[PDB]
Design a protein around this ligand. Structure first.
Ligand code: ALF
Ligand SMILES: [Ca+2]
Ligand SMILES: [Mg+2]
Length: 1155
């Protein structure tokens, strides 16, 4: 293979051809002078030198052939490589290379090779594909990505980075600059011309232009020019709207910032753009709206960072140096060196200083680090590349449309063959025969299909703006009608980012006055605010934290600690001080931390509390601990009588409860220096007391439960993908009723041996623990009894084995997944056969948002902020929202924080999915009657009047415009709409209705010929004359055109009813009433109004009978074929157990009885 990248499937070297050797110029140069000579001076009519119709046919044919030969190089890259290039012999003369990627990872392309000359008189051959560099390696004679110092076949020794210095000499700097490039992101941001060029090449636009050009034979310039002008205006405004919304939602701007680099033995100030792998950079605090420029490894110093891009959370992480490690291989994947790597894109919250290479300290007093990657090869470079180079634009050009056009073209060719044969048997003029064949060919295949689908989509696009839900690709709305799996994020989508504190309860335990309210089992539900709390609870809350105050006054730490400190009201100060209703001073000396084992935070301090209520004074040493109720129960010496039951009620009703405890070490005096250091964790937990139960409200949006419940019972499956801990993910997923059963977490053992690999089925309570290996099937029983929660660490161990497909069907919760793993799940679900939706807000789910069929990016705005922005803009004509990165990669964008915008889009999908489907069916019917009205009826003497066709045309236009516009129904239904158009039901219904219409027309024509015989000749140029046959055929055609609209219209569970459609119902009623009144002949003036012949008494009953028979037969055929072959059932992954259905029915009945 040429390219050694799994992204690239195949490659081929090419060499360009000159302009005169192309495949669409040279045959034209051969052909054109021959025809010119024949038409000009041959004087022999081999190609009809004098006939105007034949010469025009030749000119149009040759021009169309040349235009198609030119356009075929734009719709494919194989034809581009076969028409405008030749296969090169080797790399010596090759200049262009054609690259094709994996079918689900981009688009094919043909790139240009570039050769650069290094100072050592050598040649470097490279090419750029999807803004990614590829180099030609002659040692293995292939193409590779690049070779960095961090990644190599032998793992580098730590002495390479510990003793590293800056890049010396100008030659090395120039070589690195010309070999690795600059550290920047080059977004092309195309202009209007490129967008219009891309839009005007699409096959539907070419088809419409060709049809309109064919309408220039004898229809005169009136109809063709107006249609062409409106088409050009519509395409121009579509392109302008697309470019405007692309510029509004997609910016992708990164501003460089100055940094200090140790180059040539001195510290200089360099912009962040000019950085090369091997520099010695000094990192400091990262300001607002900025991040780390390049991927680097820390050498000296400690950094507190905020990795909000990879994990998705906001908990600060601690990264240590590498100075305390000997010469060893870099274990950067999972070893001790993973905590030393500093990724590019995160923010450095704090820098702590505390060298082997003898380097002077930087002037800005930062931390030394060595760059390892730069440019588009960093961690966020892959996300930026997948933002814009992952999927193709979705438009009206589908395979279903092509098959539909081919079907109608087959019928058109049959009709044209019949017309041409009957016209050549009678030896008529070839001009009128050819014009009629062209007319029926253009009439059968509808040129109005794309401009009707576009209107049906733009109506939904305009209707979606009321919920502040903007869209970028409008043709993805029908995909929302067949959604089978709907994933969800956790930290930004369902759970609210902010946190509130309800208060502290359980302080009435121990001695009770029988006055506080109690539950049925005796649980104390007394709620006391923190401002009215006791002295002991405040003292414990003022020391059991882990927050640290920066030099500029900012504070960092856990969100719950910040929330409880804000609720406390005390103020943190330097040297670990807590100052001021207690109005005391707390000085914390020693602190203890937890790492998910023995979950409790302990601290010691010196306290001076001057109570204002009781007027007492407290001073001296103090010990405060905060943790789980079970651990405090284990370490308690005087357990209250209702301690066990008073927290179960709180933790059951969606809340987080934490127990607090205190210990008075020395009442008088302080412990002093060199005394707390020798104390261990077990020593301070000898005796404990009880202070209270801090209760925190469950972080969840008020619309989360309602939206998930609406999605669950509407034949959709809701899964959840998050990068948080499995415990919190399982708790949140159980609260919103995503999973309601026993939950098993497949993950590494909690012992964390870190040396051997193992997979176990843990539980929420450590009572079930079995061993599973990734090379065997999962279980025949686990997938049936208990639900699953597969973590992201063990997802890679199951990649490629036989258990991968079993773990993509019976799992609903994924926890701790990398940004790359968030799209593997969606790709697997898409390849399995399901449609997927995903809603998220962060930067880690960019690839998942791109690879899903429809993606929503929920922002953090509110209605009041939107109103303020609108009124500020209005005042400018006479606050802001953070766009982020998720809105760039998501086709949809909801500007409101409500998660109810996720079901609403679905409510606006089905109405677009149903209507479009109906359109297809109805169009097919009108593309089959007309083919019968121009091939068999045209050859007879049946010709309608000039005034009668206007009514039919107006009725058809009104009905089509009313069908294209649609409105949404109130609530989601259990039955799904028809997915595609090429199943047995649609084709069977179309063919049955066409057969009924043909049989009725044949019977009416036969009986009308029997009643009134014809003895004259059939004239194809005679004008309109009133007769029985013309009136009968006109009435039957009007009734059939009414029946094609009043039978194939379904709107009961997915749209508005036919009675509420004012545009269509009134027209249908009026036309049907007029036709039936003229058939039954109750108004003699009406028949004379539009040139009708008086009817016999016996013919009237036959006419009414056949009209009613036609209507009833069409309705019965449609109903039977809908009842027999409807694909209205739910998918296999969305099946609901009887228990869930029974619970839903019980809840619905209770709500109905309540109201
Ligand atoms: F809320 Al996440 F990855 F868990 F964006
Ligand atoms: Ca038509
Ligand atoms: Mg998030």
């Amino acid at each position: 293979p040429l390219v050694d990248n799994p992204q690239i499937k195949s490659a081929e070297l090419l060499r360009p051809l000159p302009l005169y050797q192309h495949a669409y110029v040279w045959p034209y140069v051969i052909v054109w002078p021959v025809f010119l000579r024949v038409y000009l001076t041959q004087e022999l009519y081999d190609k009809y030198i004098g006939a105007q119709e034949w010469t025009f046919v030749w000119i149009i044919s040759i021009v169309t052939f040349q235009t198609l030969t030119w356009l075929c190089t734009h719709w494919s890259v194989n034809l581009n490589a076969l028409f405008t290039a030749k296969k090169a012999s080797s790399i010596e003369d090759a200049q262009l290379i054609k690259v094709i990627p994996v079918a689900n990872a981009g688009a094919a392309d043909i790139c240009k090779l570039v050769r650069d000359k290094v100072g050592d008189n050598k040649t470097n051959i490279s090419f750029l594909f999807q803004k990614r560099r590829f180099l030609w390696y002659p040692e293995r004679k292939a193409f590779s990505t690049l070779e960095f110092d961090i990644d190599a076949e032998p793992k580098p020794t730590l002495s390479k980075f510990q003793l590293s210095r800056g890049i010396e000499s100008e030659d090395e700097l120039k070589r690195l600059e010309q070999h690795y490039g600059t550290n920047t992101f080059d977004i092309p941001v195309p202009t209007f011309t490129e967008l219009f060029k891309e839009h005007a090449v699409a096959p539907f636009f070419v088809f419409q232009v060709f049809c309109v050009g064919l309408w220039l034979l004898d229809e005169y310039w009136y109809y063709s020019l107006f249609t062409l002008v409106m088409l050009v205006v519509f395409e121009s405004t579509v392109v302008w709207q697309r470019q405007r919304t692309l510029t509004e939602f997609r910016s992708m701007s990164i501003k460089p910032y100055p940094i200090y680099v140790y180059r040539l033995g001195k510290w200089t100030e360099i912009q962040s753009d000019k950085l090369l792998p091997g520099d010695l950079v000094s990192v400091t605090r990262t300001k607002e709206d900025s991040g780390v420029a390049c991927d680097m490894i820390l050498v000296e110093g400690t950094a507190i960072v905020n990795e909000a891009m990879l994990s998705g959370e906001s908990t600060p992480l601690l990264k240590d140096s590498i100075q305390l490690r000997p010469g060893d291989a870099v274990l950067e994947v999972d070893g001790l060196d993973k905590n030393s790597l500093l990724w590019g894109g995160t923010k450095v919250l704090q820098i702590t200083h505390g060298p082997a290479s003898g380097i002077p300290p930087p002037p800005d007093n930062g931390a030394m680090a060595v760059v390892t990657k730069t440019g588009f090869e960093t961690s966020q470079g892959s996300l930026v590349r997948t933002m814009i180079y992952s999927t193709e634009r979705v438009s009206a050009n589908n395979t279903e449309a092509l098959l539909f056009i081919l079907f109608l073209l087959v019928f058109a060719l049959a009709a044209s063959w019949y017309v041409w044969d009957e016209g050549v048997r009678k030896d008529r003029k070839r001009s009128k025969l050819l014009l009629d064949c062209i007319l029926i060919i253009t009439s059968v295949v509808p040129p109005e299909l794309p401009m009707e689908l576009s209107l049906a989509v733009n109506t939904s696009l305009s209707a979606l703006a009321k919920f502040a839900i903007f869209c970028t690709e409008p043709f993805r709305i029908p995909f929302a009608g067949r959604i089978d799996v709907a994933c969800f994020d956790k930290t930004g989508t369902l759970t609210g980012e902010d946190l509130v504190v309800e208060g502290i309860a359980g302080l009435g335990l121990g001695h009770s006055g029988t006055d506080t309210p109690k539950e049925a089992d005796g649980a104390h539900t007394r709620m006391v605010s923190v401002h009215d709390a006791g002295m002991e609870t405040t003292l414990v809350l003022a020391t059991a934290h882990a927050l640290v105050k920066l030099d500029e006054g900012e504070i960092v730490g856990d969100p719950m600690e910040k929330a409880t400190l804000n609720a406390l009201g005390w103020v943190l100060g330097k040297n670990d001080t807590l100052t001021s209703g207690i109005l005391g001073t707390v000085q914390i000396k020693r602190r203890f931390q937890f790492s998910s084992a023995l979950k409790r935070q302990s601290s010691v301090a010196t306290i001076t509390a001057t109570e204002v209520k009781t007027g007492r004074k407290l001073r001296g040493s103090f010990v405060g601990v905060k943790g789980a109720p079970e651990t405090i129960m284990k370490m308690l010496v005087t357990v209250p009588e209702h301690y066990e039951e008073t927290y179960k009620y709180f933790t059951r009703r969606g809340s987080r409860v934490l127990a607090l405890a205190y210990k008075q070490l020395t009442t008088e005096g302080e412990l002093g220096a060199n005394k707390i250091n020798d104390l261990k964790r077990e020593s301070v937990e000898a005796d404990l007391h009880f202070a209270g139960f801090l209760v925190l409200q469950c972080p969840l949006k008020e619309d989360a439960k309602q939206a998930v419940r609406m999605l669950n019972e509407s034949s959709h499956r809701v899964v959840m993908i998050t990068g948080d801990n499995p415990l919190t993910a399982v708790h949140v997923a159980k609260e919103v009723e995503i999973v309601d059963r026993d939950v098993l977490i497949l993950d590494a053992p909690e012992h964390s041996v870190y040396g051997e690999e193992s997979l176990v089925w843990r539980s929420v309570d450590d009572k079930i623990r079995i061993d599973v290996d990734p090379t065997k099937p999962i279980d025949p029983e686990i997938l049936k009894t208990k639900d699953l929660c597969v973590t992201g660490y063990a997802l890679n161990k199951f990649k490629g084995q036989v258990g991968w497909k079993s773990l993509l069907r019976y799992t609903w919760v994924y926890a701790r997944v990398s940004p790359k793993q968030k799209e593997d799940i969606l790709l697997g679900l898409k390849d399995m056969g399901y449609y997927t939706l995903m809603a998220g807000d962060g930067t880690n789910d960019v690839g998942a948002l791109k690879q899903a069929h429809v993606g929503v990016a929920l922002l953090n705005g509110t209605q009041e902020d939107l109103n303020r922005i609108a009124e500020h803009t209005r005042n400018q004509k006479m606050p802001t929202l953070k766009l982020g990165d998720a809105s760039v990669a998501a086709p949809f964008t909801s500007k409101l924080r409500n998660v109810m915008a996720i079901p609403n889009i679905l409510r606006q999908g089905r109405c677009t999915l149903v209507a479009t489907i109906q359109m297809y069916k109805i169009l097919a019917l009108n593309c089959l009657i007309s083919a019968y009205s121009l091939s068999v009826l045209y050859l007879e003497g049946i010709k309608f009047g000039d005034g009668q066709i206007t009514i039919s045309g107006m009725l058809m236009s009104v009905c089509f415009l009313s069908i294209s516009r649609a409105r949404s129904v109130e609530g989601l239904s259990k039955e799904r709409p028809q997915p595609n158009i090429f199943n047995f039901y649609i084709i069977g219904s179309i063919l049955g209705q066409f057969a009924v219409h043909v049989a009725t027309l044949i019977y009416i024509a036969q009986l009308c010929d029997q009643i009134e015989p014809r003895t004259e000749v059939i004239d194809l140029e005679a004008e309109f004359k009133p007769s029985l046959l013309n009136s009968a055929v006109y009435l039957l055609q009007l009734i059939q055109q009414i029946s094609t609209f009043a039978v194939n219209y379904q709107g009961r569970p997915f749209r508005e009813s036919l009675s509420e459609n004012k545009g269509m119902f009134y027209g249908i009623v009026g036309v049907t009433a007029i036709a039936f009144a003229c058939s039954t002949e109750m108004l003699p003036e009406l028949n004379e109004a539009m040139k009708l012949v008086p009817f016999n008494e016996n013919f009237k009953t036959i006419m009414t009978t056949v009209m009613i028979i036609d209507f009833v037969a069409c309705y019965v055929i449609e109903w039977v074929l809908k009842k027999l072959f409807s694909d209205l059932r739910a998918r296999d992954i969305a099946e609901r157990r009887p228990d869930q259905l029974e619970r839903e029915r019980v809840r619905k009945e209770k709500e109905a009885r309540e109201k």
